[PDB]
């Protein structure tokens, strides 16, 4: 480690700690910068040489983290918890958690190489037919979204899961052991316990379970209604009205979001078409229009525009030179208070427009907290960070707002039109809930050792069936590693944040709508141009992780806890409607034929 980046000496007290944090701050930015830059260079241009550079950068970060971590632990270990400055406690607490920096050098290099190889496998995996091969984004994504051929969807689903999952498995095992070894030296029973500690809630798991209990009936009814719509198209052979839905038929590789099957499920097709994808295509929208439209929502609230550095640096389309990139949309803070970027292989669709807002919400958080200490540049919790862009996207999605931006010619205000809208939103928001909940249940079980490698797939499918009521459309065994075919698993990005975000965003929505002085139905609120709503949201953003999330939430929404009531309020009309419809159709709620799998198509997989 560079002499300039090394910690000096400070007194064994709070006044020393302060100078410690400020000295940390000065060097941490450069170290964070070089790490993020190397990661950027790799993720926008996947090469062996860029991987080597990124690992080298990661080693430097671990060296830095070890030095300042051991210094923090040398001077402040039995005393930091009693510090009077709560922000300083949070800075110190972060600095003294070494993570992977606890590993000896050889194991550090192993760990860094595993992360690099897992990332490369996921993002360069292909499905091949001919010499021609399909990438996940955009090829397989488009098939899952718009093909209605059972056999073709199966080819894409199986192809992807086989291609990404199978080679990831041995690496993922090794990563798990090393991660646990690292965090066990920070005092956590396993990595999952460390991840859960970010919510600073001794009752976190029970609180999530209580939330899910309230949400589950909404999902069960949506599921039964959707299954019926699928049965009408795919027939009795491929859809079991009392069994799980085959996992490839829901519009999405992970069946995580069901908005792409909206045309099959739309209750009243004679009302205005609420999926504006075809209109965006008709009008010739490109990625840059999408990002500018997103930005203009943020400025309408008197939040920050995207700086020149964002526009100059970002990767907003998949590169045309055909170079390998990480296509999964992400938002980047370079920690120099200047560079902030999105990397998205943007496609011209309504869901992608929502995704643009999601990523821009991350950027806005970065812009607002850029002048806090580096350790405090994160959300009040990770679910807050995930919720910002989605909150705005809720307003953007409204038929009224779409009309304002020229994406919906007709405007209607009737019960049918409300049901269509709320159903479309349920496909996006309700359908996701089980998946957002289950991923880290799976991962926590793996970190804790409850799920050994011998049960990775058995336990993944247990949870997928239990929560989502889906089944794999082909037979799977333990050679398959279907959890690894989801981005966040090989890229080691925690998932419970998305479940938290999906509850939280409705709490935020309700509060900002109230602040905007909006008086109507919650699901028709558009906060666009509300400078009052903007100021309320800005208070959250500028706080970063400087204050307990429970207190930041209290200030914003009047409650110090996650609460399903705003989501329930928002969906109330369609919750009642689906329940009525299912009863009148004589549906079974759930999937009591839990063992059921669909047969293979006759000529699978030739032609
Ligand atoms: C779409 O339509 C709904 C429903 O509108 C109501 O019912 C219709 C069948 C007609 O009879 C309408 O004349 C009638 O307003 C609209 O929701 C409604 O918005 C109004 C005005 O913002 C709300 O009234 C307010 O109520 C609060 C107290 O809650 C008072 O403080 C205010 O002074 C104000 O009078 C009303 O609560 C609300 N109705 C329901 C059932 O939620 C909606 O605004 C409209 N949307 C669009 C996009 O046009
Ligand atoms: C993708 O990454 C490679 C490195 O792996 C880049 O190629 C290098 O570019 C530097 C600086 O422009 C040159 O000095 C080197 O000669 C190149 N090195 C190697 C090993 O080829 C490449 O430019 C990157 N591509 C894009 C489009 O950014
Ligand atoms: C696509 C994207 O980057 N956004 C994600 C986070 O990775 C997100 O908001 N949530 C879920 C579901 C989704 O609709 O994107 C995800 O795993 O992608
Ligand atoms: C799992 O399934 C594949 C193909 O369906 C098969 O080739 C393989 O033998 C099975 N793996 C094991 C370990 O039995
Ligand atoms: Cl998280
Ligand atoms: Zn995100």
Numbering used by the authors: 1 to 129, 133 to 610
From the paper:
Angiotensin-1-converting enzyme (ACE, EC 3.4.15.1) is a zinc peptidase and a key enzyme in cardio-vascular physiology.
Co-crystallisation experiments were carried out to assess the interaction between the N-domain and tetrapeptide Ac-SDKP. One form presented the same cell dimensions as the previously described minimally glycosylated N-domain30 with 2 chains per asymmetric unit in P1. The two peptides have their C-terminal end strongly anchored by hydrogen bonds with residues Lys489, Tyr498 and Gln259 forming the S2′ site, amino acids previously shown to be key anchoring residues. On the other hand, the N-acetyl-serine (AcS), of the Ac-Ser-Asp fragment, presents a different orientation. Its Hydroxyl side chain makes direct electrostatic contacts with His331, His491 and Tyr501, as well as a water-mediated interaction with Zn2+. The AcS amino group interacts with a single water molecule itself connected to Thr358 (main chain) and Asp393. The acetyl moiety may be stabilised in the small hydrophobic area composed of Ala332 and Thr358.
